Design a binder for this molecule. Structure first.
Ligand SMILES: Nc1ncnc2c1ncn2[C@@H]1O[C@H](COP(=O)(O)OP(=O)(O)O)[C@@H](O)[C@H]1O
Ligand code: BEF
Length: 1143
């Protein structure tokens, strides 16, 4: 083309006049036309990710990025070993590959690596036709460094179960099972982390060492030798020398890598193929050197703590001059967006930048510049769309500009006068003047719409995965056995206690008195919820305290049972309501919203709209973190409410945020004809009466106000929608007082963080719940600083935000000394313009200075906790508090996250009085809030607050209490028992808990042996599932799953399955208790059985000696069933024949 290609160690090519996103075009071109692999060096790893898209967007050659360590140099955490997988694979094949593009940032090119002899000297291949021992391969894996686990879920672990060994290779992404057979590899089956069954069988597998360093005995001794040669040992049970010598691995041990090879580690340059070409963008002569400075700076910063010392930086990272010399050994190309006219191997190819093409909604012709420029472009114009649906979203836009470009795949496909489009993540369009090509990106006109996972992958907390993290069976966590009391779970054990070895779950009580409970009676154990995992009560066994507490609870539930019998339903007398939504009308309202919702916001919208469309009323928690645009869900709910004209009301515990919602709703409905108004202290009673009259006649649909409505004064013609914000700070019977008016109203519970009782109820599932863990695009984190009382940090932070041009939120929490403090901090900060705010003011100047804050005429505001509700403006970007000894975690997090709603990094300066003046609980609160600082932190903080404040009375008042109440589920058990007492009118009795659906014990061992399943959690899960079976199809699929996950089925397993099947069939039949032994047994029916009495008596008289009706419902039979198989077959055929003549 316009230039040659550089192939020489010293050859350097330099290219200029290269606009943004044309670097990708040039890179793809040269890689496709370069006879050899391509390695690209990027200045910023994040930028490299961007490259990883656009390159793959424009070409089809395999493009990969060097997996890199996430942690900062000399950190105290592992590199998140999963990433290591993606690394090692690329390392293993790296020498042997001809075409392909590998992209690396300089910060990781700076890092030393393994010698690859260590790598491919340990690179095993397992093949079908191999007579290899299970144990030999086991020890082989152990030497390789794979970790022995029992429920493999991650990279680099292996588990065993009888003849079935399974593991996860470090190179591939899916684990594998083997199915050994006579020490022969019979199968090699891939299986998902959650299917635990075959997806397919592959002929052979290749596996790589577990880590980036050996871990055999030779490795340990070499490491110890190097250590004793270099550093100084400390005789200590956590000094990494002793910890390594023990056998384990320190968390950060990966940074002490050069102590494992007795060699200078390669600079990774040896791994380049014999014929490569370096291509470089930006510049390294600043990035690499600044990185070296940062590494040494952090090193010297942490040159303390003799336990866990640090290597010199030069031993692990390279030198800059050495890096330059090394790169001068390969041909290299450099790209920059400047003018280099001198002289050869240096060109300036026409890649003009995109002109100012954009769309303006206010203009009558948004695509004015677009249509002006399209017709002035003689060449083809090709658009790029980052997704699929958006393509149509822009095709309609092209219909507004009356053009239908054809979708192409490659840039060369463009004709002379051709308009086209393609799916790509390109950022900036441009004008390739070489052949007059116009490339257009979405941001060219749309602007900023970013949906990538900008946040760190590890920096995420899934709510459902947090519940599934564990809900049972932690070896120390407490549980409650309703018969006796509360203890700590300790595990499983098999016991021979009557000639049949049965499983038993063992609990421990006070004074170390153990209690084993049979596995079958599992439904008598509840997971503790009193929230005292470290200070919980420990009932001493055989005491009356638990019985007394249970009797008190029984009395309380009987009282509330009468109360519910007043309603004559289990909160079920309600029929609800159905809303009608017009999809086009709602879509029009979506159009009136000038934003794009996050995916979880869209999910919440779908859930709420569907639920209201259902003919039942809602009680739905939308508990997401602040700054997630929760209010817009309410806006759309109110729009659909006014579509039905259902007189929606809204509640908030303040006047500031009430006014905020008022103006927001006015903005949403300044185009839609509908009446929005407010009723609170600000309004005069003269107009409050008018508001009440208007809402009595129904001329008002949207009302915003505080507790004035729940004063038996407001009248609604048709109250159909009620909204509540910030459920916290609300006492009980507020919701009951607002519910009393109309039962079938849709309840929408908006909040930022639930109080412990509400959170526990959400966990119970009795109330609908929803979480939005998807922050807006530009909502970066909020910095937090827990500092002691310094008068200078506050002043300098105030000045830092003033020079930024923002507003400071000053918290002192006083209505007397706030006056003096305002002038005190004015003297401290003469540059500051301050207003005084407190809730004990006439509210006229309050709203006036709120308006002033909207205009930002004064910078820092002193206020009490009325600020907590929050009307945050994006201008405000910093909060300094004064009292940090008494504030709830919910308030702390809420005021932390209240700042932002903008692209600019906010701040949260936290001022504390003397540490010794702090009580223990204050220290715990402050250390907890400091420990967590990231997006999606409110929900996890609420989970932590659970077990701290403790869920309160699930029945009585005073929520969020840590009293000694019975757990959660037992309350529901007694409630349904009393509902039975009401429906059947039966007497209250503590016997329904002592339940018995069907007992089919026959003195025959039946259990899931631990050898057949290693762990206990899965064993108990299957125990519960089998106990709660409903049809023989369930049993069949369970048997299939057991076959998959654990191979063959032991005799006890088969017996358990068939006993469950027989219990199922007997429950279908109508018999309740079928018992027996070797010499015979008894059959006992129900009150209304379905066995034919005629033939029943016929059998009775046919063989009275072998059959005797001894009791109103008891049939005694004698049988010589010395074989378990004979016993089971006899009973099966007996019951089958009995039910054959079923009446
Ligand atoms: N997906 C989004 N992208 C950009 N900005 C958003 C998004 N969602 C919300 N916002 C902005 O952030 C602000 C959040 O205010 P609000 O609805 O009160 O959030 P929260 O109720 O969580 O405090 C809104 O005023 C809105 O303008
Ligand atoms: F209700 Be929010 F957090 F604005």
């Amino acid at each position: 083309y316009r230039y040659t290609l550089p192939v020489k160690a010293g050859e350097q090519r330099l290219l200029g006049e290269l606009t943004g996103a044309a670097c990708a075009t040039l890179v793809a071109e040269i890689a496709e036309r370069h006879a050899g692999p391509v390695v690209l060096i990027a200045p910023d790893m994040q930028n490299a990710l961007r490259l990883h898209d656009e390159i793959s967007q424009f070409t089809d050659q395999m493009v990969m990025n060097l997996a890199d360590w996430e942690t900062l140099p000399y950190d105290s955490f592992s590199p998140h070993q999963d990433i290591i997988s993606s690394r090692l694979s690329t390392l293993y094949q790296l020498p042997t590959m001809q075409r392909g593009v590998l992209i690396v940032p300089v910060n990781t090119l700076m890092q030393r690596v393994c010698p690859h002899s260590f790598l491919h000297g340990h690179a095993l291949v397992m093949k079908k036709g191999q007579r290899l021992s299970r144990d030999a391969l086991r020890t082989q894996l152990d030497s390789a460094g794979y970790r022995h686990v029992d429920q493999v879920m991650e990279h680099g672990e292996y588990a065993t179960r009888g003849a079935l060994l399974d593991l996860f290779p470090m190179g591939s992404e899916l684990p594998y099972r083997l199915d050994f057979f006579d020490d022969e590899i019979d199968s090699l089956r891939v299986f998902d982390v959650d299917s635990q069954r075959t997806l397919e069988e592959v002929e052979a597998i290749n596996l790589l060492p577990a880590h980036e360093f050996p871990t055999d005995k030779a490795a340990i001794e070499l490491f110890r030798s190097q250590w004793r040669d270099t550093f100084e040992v400390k005789r200590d049970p956590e000094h990494i020398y002793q910890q390594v010598s023990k056998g384990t691995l320190p968390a950060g041990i990966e940074y002490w890598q050069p102590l494992f090879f007795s060699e200078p580690l390669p600079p990774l340059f040896s791994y380049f193929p014999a014929n490569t070409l370096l291509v470089n963008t930006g510049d390294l002569e600043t990035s690499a050197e600044r990185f070296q400075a940062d590494t040494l700076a952090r090193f010297e910063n942490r040159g303390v703590d003799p336990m866990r010392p640090l290597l010199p930086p030069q031993s692990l990272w390279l030198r800059v001059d050495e890096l330059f010399s090394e790169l001068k050994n390969w041909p290299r190309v450099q790209l920059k967006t400047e003018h280099l006219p001198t002289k050869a191997a240096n060109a300036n190819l026409g890649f003009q930048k995109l002109p100012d093409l954009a769309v303006q909604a206010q203009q009558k012709a948004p695509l004015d510049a677009l249509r002006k420029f399209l017709e002035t472009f003689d060449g083809p114009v090709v658009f790029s769309v980052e997704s699929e649906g958006r393509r149509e979203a822009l095709g309609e836009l092209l219909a507004r500009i009356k053009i239908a470009p054809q979708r192409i795949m490659r840039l060369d496909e463009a004709s002379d006068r051709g308009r086209y489009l393609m799916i790509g993540a390109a950022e900036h369009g441009f004008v390739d003047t070489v052949r007059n090509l116009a490339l257009i990106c979405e941001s060219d006109l749309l602007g900023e719409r970013v949906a990538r996972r900008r946040q760190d992958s590890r920096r995420t907390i899934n709510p459902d995965t947090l519940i599934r993290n564990l809900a049972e069976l932690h070896i120390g966590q407490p549980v409650v056995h309703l018969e006796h009391g509360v203890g700590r779970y300790a595990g499983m054990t098999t016991l021979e206690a009557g000639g049949i070895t049965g499983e038993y779950l063992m609990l421990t009580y006070a004074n170390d008195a153990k209690l084993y409970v049979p596995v079958s009676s599992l439904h008598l154990i509840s997971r503790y919820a009193g929230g005292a995992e470290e200070n919980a009560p420990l009932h001493k066994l055989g005491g009356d305290a638990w019985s007394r507490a249970r009797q008190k609870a029984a009395e309380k539930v009987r009282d509330v049972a009468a109360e519910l019998l007043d309603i004559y339903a289990q909160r079920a007398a309600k029929e609800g309501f159905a809303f009608k939504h017009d999809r086009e009308q709602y879509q029009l309202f979506c159009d009136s919203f000038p934003f794009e919702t996050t995916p979880d916001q869209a999910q919440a919208i779908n859930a709420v709209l569907s639920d209201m469309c259902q003919p039942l009323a809602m009680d739905r928690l939308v508990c997401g973190d602040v700054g997630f645009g929760k209010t817009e869900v309410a806006m759309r709910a109110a729009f659909l409410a006014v579509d039905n004209h259902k007189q929606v009301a809204v509640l908030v515990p303040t006047t500031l945020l009430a006014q905020q919602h008022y103006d927001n709703f006015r903005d949403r409905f300044a185009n839609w004809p509908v009446r929005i108004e407010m009723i609170s202290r600000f309004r005069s009673a003269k107009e409050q009466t008018q508001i009440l009259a208007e809402v009595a006649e129904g001329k008002i649909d949207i009302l915003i106000g505080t507790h004035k409505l729940l004063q038996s004064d407001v009248k609604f013609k048709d109250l159909g929608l009620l909204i509540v914000d910030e459920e916290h700070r609300f006492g009980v019977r507020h919701k009951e007082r607002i519910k009393a008016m109309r039962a079938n109203v849709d309840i929408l519970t908006l909040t930022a963080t639930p109080i412990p009782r509400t959170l526990n109820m959400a966990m119970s599932g009795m109330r609908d719940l929803s979480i939005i863990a998807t922050p807006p695009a530009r909502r970066l984190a909020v910095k937090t600083f827990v500092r002691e009382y310094d008068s200078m940090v506050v002043r300098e932070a105030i000045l830092r935000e003033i020079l930024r041009g923002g507003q400071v939120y000053y918290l002192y929490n006083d209505v007397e000394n706030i006056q003096k403090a305002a002038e005190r901090l004015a003297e401290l900060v003469p540059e500051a313009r301050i207003a005084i705010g407190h809730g004990q003011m006439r509210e006229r100047e309050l709203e006036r200075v709120m308006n002033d804050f909207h205009h930002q005429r004064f910078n820092v505001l002193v206020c009490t906790t009325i600020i907590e509700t929050g009307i945050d403006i994006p201008t405000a970007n910093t909060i300094i508090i004064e009292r940090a000894d008494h504030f709830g975690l919910a308030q702390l997090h809420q005021l932390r996250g209240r700042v932002g709603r903008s692209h600019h990094q906010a701040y949260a300066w936290l001022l504390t009085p003397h540490p010794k003046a702090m009580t223990t609980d204050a220290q715990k609160r402050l250390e907890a809030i400091a420990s967590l600082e990231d997006l999606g932190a409110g929900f996890a903080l609420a989970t932590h607050d659970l077990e701290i404040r403790g869920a309160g009375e699930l029945l009585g008042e005073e929520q969020s209490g840590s009293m000694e109440t019975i757990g959660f589920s037992l309350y529901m058990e007694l409630l349904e028992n009393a509902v039975d007492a009401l429906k059947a009118g039966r007497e209250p009795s503590l016997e329904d808990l002592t339940s018995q659906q069907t007992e089919v014990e026959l003195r025959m061992p039946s259990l899931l042996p631990d050898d057949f399943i290693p762990d206990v959690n899965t064993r108990l899960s299957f125990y519960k599932r089998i106990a709660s079976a409903k049809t023989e199809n369930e049993l069949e699929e369970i048997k299939v799953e057991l076959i998959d996950r654990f191979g063959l089925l032991p005799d006890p397993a088969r017996t358990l399955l068939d006993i469950a099947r027989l219990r199922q069939q007997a429950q279908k039949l109508g018999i309740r208790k079928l018992e027996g032994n070797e010499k015979g047994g008894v059959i006992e029916f129900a009150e209304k059985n379905h066995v034919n009495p005629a033939w029943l008596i016929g059998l009775l008289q046919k063989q009275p000696q072998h059959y005797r009706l001894d009791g109103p419902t008891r049939l005694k039979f004698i049988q010589d069933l010395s074989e378990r198989k004979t016993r089971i077959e006899w009973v099966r055929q007996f019951m089958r024949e009995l039910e054959e003549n079923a009446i």
